[PDB]
Structures are given as structure tokens and as C-alpha cells.
Amino acid sequence: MTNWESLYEKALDKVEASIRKVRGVLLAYNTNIDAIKYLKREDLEKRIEKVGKEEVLRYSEELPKEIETIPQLLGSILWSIKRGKAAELLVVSREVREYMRKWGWDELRMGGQVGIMANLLGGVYGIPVIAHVPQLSELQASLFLDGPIYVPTFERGELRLIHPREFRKGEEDCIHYIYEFPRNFKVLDFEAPRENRFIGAADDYNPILYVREEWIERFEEIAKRSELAIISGLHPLTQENHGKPIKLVREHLKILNDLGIRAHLEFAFTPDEVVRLEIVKLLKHFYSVGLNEVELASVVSVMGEKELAERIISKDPADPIAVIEGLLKLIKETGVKRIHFHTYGYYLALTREKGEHVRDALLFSALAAATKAMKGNIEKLSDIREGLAVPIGEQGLEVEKILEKEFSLRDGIGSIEDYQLTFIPTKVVKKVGIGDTISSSAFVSEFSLH
């Protein structure tokens, strides 16, 4: 058997030494505020009564396309509760937003793929970040950590990087209200199958991939102050609104390519199939892509390999060889140099680049994931050491045995064609932005190790 605990310890020590070499990561585009409310039975019942139990129940059987009224909000909540399933809808009514603001919340956290990675890369790991923030209100700014986290501003056309807390006041709050409920939560006559949540997004900016004027007119000058880039926030775009923003992203990718700045994308699930296909075509401009089993299956599916997509998500844990067939398919169609697959019990990477540093980056990112799941947050880099005590999970060990026999992985490493195949078993706490912590941590630390 492999001494995974020794490899995990060495990987952490190596990344702690090397992570300081990264000069700057550019992070765009989606940043918001997350406001979490822990639902309570009597309050939720009374609010449903006030607005009409009848209408609310109607929307619990069939989700609205968006939330225009308070019965739509409450009924959407109820939909998630009785399916124990997560859903998110835009809230497009000012009256409903006011209703939600007054109903309030219990916990305030940074939100958005940019915001959370700024706090992780910048605040925890100490790597300078340049972050794209659609609306940097005082509240938005207050949620950034300490450390080298910057937003670009321009004085006499001169670029100045400043901490969010020093940015001018005036912009508005982009709040996603996260309505959480426990297992078997009861309301009226329903009880939730699973613990879960409904998200009402009171957000006019990120759902359309809003881009700040200065990042449209001065992108090259901004990008020149970074060494790596992580692009995020494409997933909500639809056939209606994708035109202008995809054109912006493509122009920005070409500049990053001209500047030699390697870019990573976590291929978050993208419901609109046309846009999902457009993101696939954008992948030609990326060095690296990350995805999980649902995402990989979604992508293989829209490409017309419906049988393979079914296999990718069919077994728990995912039939690793089907996964690898999907990765090999994607890596040859797109030309990306790096694909990091992450699921519950294990990660895989398929890379043109070779060596132990690919494995060490995956192990580090799994420690970060385990520390975040356990603590809920990460405050300091050396706290990741706590992940060393988390046991490796049964599913990871089961998949290792399959990959040891079918590829000839030693200490998680083997080769197929001109790729290295890298595997690690995850340390599972099982208790957010975990997926982004995983694929951003592996991407940045692998580069720091090289």
C-alpha cells in the first residue's frame, strides 16, 4: 500500500516553501456578498400565511423562472425544502429585495468565485491578487481578508492597486440570500429529505457577467501586473445575454495569451447548453481546466456522448476509467495542457507537464479542502496542517486499486500516451466554495512548484 500520509506531509511542506514565489494572480469576474439565514419553522409558516398559503404552494411544485413576488420567493424556498435540493433564482423585484433585506440573515460571508479565491489566495496563502469586483460597496469591501488583495484604480490614467477597504464609497450591495434548512426541517406539512438551501440572488451584475469599464478599457495594463489568471463566472450566461460578455472574455483571453499569462477555469455547471458549448470553444485559450463529475458529464453530454456521460456520473465513486476517457476526449479537443478532475473520494489530473509537482499540488489542495470543510473557513496557511489528521477515505483507496491495476500508478503517478496521469485519494471530512478552493489551490501551487 502507498504511504499517503508521508506524501501528504511532504506536499504541504513543499507548497509552504514554494507558494511565496507567485508574484500575482488575476481573478475575474464574479464577486458578491453571501447572507445566510437559518430558517425557522414558525417564522416561515407565518410569512407564508401573510402572503397567501395557496399561491406559495403553487410555486413549490414548479419553480419560477425568476422571483418577481414574495409568494414566488417563499414557494421557491419550499421547493428546495421538499425536494431537499438546492436551487438558485434571480430576484428581480425591488419590493422582494426589500422584503429579503428586512427579513435579514444570521451570517455574512464573502461570495462569488473571485471573492472567495481572493480571500484564499491573497488572505490565507499571501499571494498578491488583483480582483474584479462588480460592485465594491463598503459592505462588500469589509468581507475581504487582510493581505495582498488589490483592486485596480486609475488616477491620471496611472494604474494604482489598492486594498478593497480603501476604495471609494458609493457602490451598491450585491447580496445572495442563502436560505438554509436542516435535515427533516418541518414547515406546514412538509419535511425536508436532506439538509440544503435555496439561494435568492439579488444581483443585477454577476448573472450577466458584468465587467467594470476600467477592465474593458485597460485590461492589458491590469493583466501585466499578474503572472497567472483564474477566470470564473461564465456559468449563468444564457442564449439571450451571452453575446457581449463572451466577446469580452475572448478578447481578455487573447491578451493573456499574448502576455504569456497562463489561465485556469473551473468549468462550473452551465445550464444553457449553447453557452456550455461556447465555453468549450473558449478552452483553447486556457492552460488549465478544473471540473467535477457532474460538470464533466454535462460537457461530454452536450458533445453528444450521452452514454459516456451516464458512466461518468453512474457509479459512486465515478468509474475512473470512464472519467479518464472523458478527460482524454476533452484534452485532445481543446488543447489545454492541464485538466484537474475532482470528486468526492479522489482527484485525477491529466497533464502534458510531468513530475511529482503535479501530485504535490493535488495533495495540497486536498488538505486545503479538508481544512476548510472542518473549520468552515481557513485563517492562516499553516492551519492547513490540521488536514493532515483527517483520514483518507474508503472510496479513494478503492479507486486507487483500480488505477493501480489498469494504469500502473505508483505513488499516484503514471503515464498514458504523452500525458502524465496523477491520482490522489481525498481526505474526507464531509461537513460554500470547496470546489473552487480545490481547483484554484492545485493550479496556483503547481505553478509555484515548477
From Swiss-Prot:
<keyword id="KW-0808">Transferase</keyword>
<dbReference type="GO" id="GO:0043843">
    <property type="term" value="F:ADP-specific glucokinase activity"/>
</dbReference>
<feature type="domain" description="ADPK">
    <location>
        <begin position="2"/>
        <end position="450"/>
    </location>
</feature>
<feature type="binding site">
    <location>
        <position position="435"/>
    </location>
    <ligand>
        <name>ADP</name>
    </ligand>
</feature>
<feature type="binding site">
    <location>
        <position position="436"/>
    </location>
    <ligand>
        <name>Mg(2+)</name>
    </ligand>
</feature>
<feature type="binding site">
    <location>
        <position position="176"/>
    </location>
    <ligand>
        <name>D-glucose</name>
    </ligand>
</feature>
<keyword id="KW-0324">Glycolysis</keyword>
<dbReference type="GO" id="GO:0006096">
    <property type="term" value="P:glycolytic process"/>
</dbReference>
<keyword id="KW-0479">Metal-binding</keyword>
<feature type="binding site">
    <location>
        <position position="266"/>
    </location>
    <ligand>
        <name>Mg(2+)</name>
    </ligand>
</feature>
<feature type="binding site">
    <location>
        <position position="295"/>
    </location>
    <ligand>
        <name>Mg(2+)</name>
    </ligand>
</feature>
<keyword id="KW-0119">Carbohydrate metabolism</keyword>
<dbReference type="InterPro" id="IPR015990">
    <property type="entry name" value="ADP_PFK/GK_arc"/>
</dbReference>
<dbReference type="GO" id="GO:0006006">
    <property type="term" value="P:glucose metabolic process"/>
</dbReference>
<dbReference type="InterPro" id="IPR007666">
    <property type="entry name" value="ADP_PFK/GK"/>
</dbReference>
<keyword id="KW-0963">Cytoplasm</keyword>
<dbReference type="GO" id="GO:0004340">
    <property type="term" value="F:glucokinase activity"/>
</dbReference>
<comment type="pathway">
    <text>Carbohydrate degradation; glycolysis.</text>
</comment>
<feature type="binding site">
    <location>
        <begin position="112"/>
        <end position="113"/>
    </location>
    <ligand>
        <name>D-glucose</name>
    </ligand>
</feature>
<feature type="binding site">
    <location>
        <position position="292"/>
    </location>
    <ligand>
        <name>ADP</name>
    </ligand>
</feature>
<dbReference type="Pfam" id="PF04587">
    <property type="entry name" value="ADP_PFK_GK"/>
</dbReference>
<keyword id="KW-0313">Glucose metabolism</keyword>
<feature type="binding site">
    <location>
        <position position="429"/>
    </location>
    <ligand>
        <name>ADP</name>
    </ligand>
</feature>
<dbReference type="GO" id="GO:0000287">
    <property type="term" value="F:magnesium ion binding"/>
</dbReference>
<feature type="binding site">
    <location>
        <position position="436"/>
    </location>
    <ligand>
        <name>D-glucose</name>
    </ligand>
</feature>
<dbReference type="GO" id="GO:0005737">
    <property type="term" value="C:cytoplasm"/>
</dbReference>
<keyword id="KW-0418">Kinase</keyword>
<feature type="active site" description="Proton acceptor">
    <location>
        <position position="436"/>
    </location>
</feature>
<keyword id="KW-0460">Magnesium</keyword>
<comment type="function">
    <text>Catalyzes the ADP-dependent phosphorylation of D-glucose to D-glucose 6-phosphate and glucosamine to glucosamine 6-phosphate.</text>
</comment>
<dbReference type="InterPro" id="IPR031299">
    <property type="entry name" value="GlkA"/>
</dbReference>
<dbReference type="InterPro" id="IPR029056">
    <property type="entry name" value="Ribokinase-like"/>
</dbReference>
<feature type="binding site">
    <location>
        <begin position="342"/>
        <end position="343"/>
    </location>
    <ligand>
        <name>ADP</name>
    </ligand>
</feature>
<protein>
    <recommendedName>
        <fullName>ADP-dependent glucose/glucosamine kinase</fullName>
        <ecNumber>2.7.1.-</ecNumber>
        <ecNumber>2.7.1.147</ecNumber>
    </recommendedName>
</protein>
<comment type="similarity">
    <text>Belongs to the ADP-dependent glucokinase family.</text>
</comment>
<feature type="binding site">
    <location>
        <position position="88"/>
    </location>
    <ligand>
        <name>D-glucose</name>
    </ligand>
</feature>
<feature type="binding site">
    <location>
        <position position="34"/>
    </location>
    <ligand>
        <name>D-glucose</name>
    </ligand>
</feature>
